[PDB]
């Protein structure tokens, strides 16, 4: 039931994407919407360990959202879950590992929807 | 399975707390460890500014962590969930709302542990 950072959101809504990086591996985090081959958003690499890289606000398009984490020119292995609070506040959580590392906490990406 | 912003973490570890706001009113988010009289961390957001208030690293103490959100002179309604990625990367999620009929997204707080 962990998936690979791919989510189905309600179509045509705003959502938030927040990245928190633990490992200082200068990761690139790309967010892709539907079948567009260019990322709708990209986080540049952390400049420090346990760094909050900020929040981006995006439109879900037709609803398909994929997060890809790259470190050292390879895709980091990912685990993702969805959860919601009272079927009102929805979350996607992605843990990534750049190693070696077996722990899925080198990088974290939080998705939240809807906004407001 | 929604609780009220209280969590049991592994005793004496570091963990992260990240806070986002999306509210009309100023909000104060307090994180309390065990029975400590003062908050271990406080995030304060400005009304009408949707803000990523950053990530703080805390010590879990004896393991009890409580999140309280105040807005408009009163405690917000809270819902919380826990989730993990491959039983390795752990998360606590809190959504808060001032208004009783809203979407538990005026305040969002994420807890993550362990670090590395």
Author numbering:
A (entry chain A), B (entry chain B): 0 to 115
Please give sentences taken from the publication describing this entry.
A family of four soluble lectins has been identified in B. cenocepacia, all of them containing at least one domain with strong sequence similarity with LecB (PA-IIL) from Pseudomonas aeruginosa. BC2L-C has an N-terminal region of 155 amino acids (the TNF-α-like lectin), a 28-aa linker region, and a 115-aa C-terminal region. Since the isolated BC2L-C-nt domain binds strongly to fucose but not to mannose and galactose, BC2L-C is therefore a novel type of lectin consisting of independent fucose and mannose-binding domains. To our knowledge, BC2L-C is the first protein identified harbouring two different lectin domains with distinct specificity, for which we refer to it to as a “superlectin”.
The C-terminal domain has sequence similarity with two-calcium bacterial lectins such as LecB/PA-IIL from P. aeruginosa (43% identity) and related ones. BC2L-C-ct bound to Man and α-methyl-mannoside (αMeMan) with a strong affinity in the micromolar range but with a stoichiometry close to 0.5, indicating that only one binding site per dimer is accessible. BC2L-C-ct is dimeric in solution with a molecular mass of 22±1 kDa whereas BC2L-C-nt is trimeric with a molecular mass of 41±1 kDa (the expected monomeric masses are 12.4 kDa and 19.3 kDa, respectively). The dimeric association displays close similarity to the lectin BC2L-A, described previously. In contrast to other crystal structures in this family, no electron density for calcium ions and monosaccharide (d-mannose) was found in the final model, presumably due to the presence of citric acid in the crystallization buffer. Without the stabilizing effect of the two calcium ions in the binding site, the acidic amino acids that mediate their binding appear to point in all directions. A sulphate ion was observed close to one of the two binding sites, establishing hydrogen bonds with Gln241, His177 and two bridging water molecules. The main difference with the mannose-binding site of RS-IIL is the presence of His177 (Asn in all other lectins). In the absence of calcium, this histidine interacts with one sulphate ion but also modifies the conformation of the C-terminus of the other chain. Since the C-terminal carboxyl group has an essential role in binding mannose and calcium in all the other similar lectins, the putative destabilizing role of His177 could account for the observed non-even stoichiometry of the dimer.
